[PDB]
Ligand binder design. Structure first.
Ligand SMILES: Cn1ncc(C(=O)N2CCC2)c1C(=O)N[C@@H]1CCn2cc(-c3ccccc3)nc2C1
Ligand SMILES: [Mg+2]
Ligand SMILES: [Zn+2]
Length: 313
């Protein structure tokens, strides 16, 4: 009822901004998440005791991998929170419940390997799920945790609202498969430009939410440059581990995953800001003007990678 979460002043202020970094104090991340559910949804969205137990079961099922870890999940939920808070009146009650949860859960039980590696390794999960292999697993792990005893944070919904929210979560996690992003963004681009984009059209809303998921998932690129840089190192730590495993399967990895080709990182960053990041936040800005700060920050980081390449760092 009356038991607000409250954050220190610097955090209380800076958490509202897109570029906020959640800090190195793991013990504070659960409290940050709850704070954001309470402001984004209401103190009355979730039974606190259930929410707390869900969060701690979610955290327990992230692994100790350089990038795809509990910090990443909480980072991705904070970017979603800042989008929701900036676009108050665009989303439903169900959407605001579903999407923070979806984001906290979107990489559950990730091992640091790509859908590619699972498929080339011939991992069991590539037999159960032949595309978006990991993302189908991350959805499946979310349903498992929701069905633990005392873990149904959705217990007050009806049969159909519950089914709607779980359907919001499932699409939202699947959309974090970057292979799906390109086609999603192009259709949104064609729709927005021709004026056919329609936010009572559920198939259009799904597209838009998928684009939000990509934006939150990649939100590394929208931080202050030192966060961006030190995050990049965790990303590459995983990719080069996967490359070492590709070499052990007797397969020359893609350069992105080859630690011997570290020199070309700056160039690959530009490619990715140009081919993925910037177009994502550009299209996001057009559909939701108040997310422009993500585009601006992303552009500032593109310029940092250019400086790296001109040897000015
Ligand atoms: C920042 N960010 N955030 C999430 C992701 C991301 O793609 N994923 C999947 C899991 C997260 C990234 C990222 O930067 N991805 C780039 C993709 C293409 N590319 C090519 C090279 C590259 C090419 C030749 C030599 C050296 C390096 N480096 C990259 C990194
Ligand atoms: Mg993922
Ligand atoms: Zn992710």
């Amino acid at each position: 009822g009356l038991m607000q979460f409250t954050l220190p002043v610097r955090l209380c202020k800076e958490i509202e901004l897109f570029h906020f970094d959640i800090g190195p104090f793991e013990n504070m991340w659960p409290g940050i998440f709850v704070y954001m559910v309470h402001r984004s949804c209401g103190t009355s969205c979730f039974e606190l005791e259930k929410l707390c137990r869900f969060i701690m079961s979610v955290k327990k099922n992230y692994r100790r991998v350089p990038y795809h870890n509990w910090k990443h999940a909480v980072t991705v939920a904070h970017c979603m929170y800042a989008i929701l808070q900036n676009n108050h009146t665009l989303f439903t009650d169900l959407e605001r419940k579903g999407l923070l949860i979806a984001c906290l859960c979107h990489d559950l039980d990730h091992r640091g390997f790509s859908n590619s590696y699972l498929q080339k390794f011939d991992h069991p999960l590539a037999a159960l799920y032949s595309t978006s292999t990991m993302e189908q697993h991350h959805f499946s792990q979310t349903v498992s945790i929701l069905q633990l005893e005392g873990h149904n944070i959705f217990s007050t919904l009806s049969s159909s609202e519950y089914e709607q929210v779980l359907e919001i979560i499932r699409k939202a996690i699947i959309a974090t498969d970057l292979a799906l992003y390109f086609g999603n963004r192009k259709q949104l681009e064609e729709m927005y430009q021709t004026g056919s984009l329609n936010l009572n059209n559920q198939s259009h809303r799904d597209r838009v939410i998928g684009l939000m998921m990509t934006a939150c998932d990649l939100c590394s690129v929208t931080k202050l440059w030192p966060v961006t840089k030190l995050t990049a190192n965790d990303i590459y730590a995983e990719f080069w581990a996967e490359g070492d495993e590709m070499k052990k399967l007797g397969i020359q990895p893609i350069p992105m995953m080859d630690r011997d080709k570290k020199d070309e990182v700056p160039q690959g960053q530009l490619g990715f800001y140009n081919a993925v990041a910037i177009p994502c936040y550009t299209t996001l800005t057009q559909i939701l003007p108040p997310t422009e700060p993500l585009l601006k920050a992303c552009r500032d980081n593109l310029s940092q990678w250019e400086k790296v390449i001109r040897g000015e760092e």
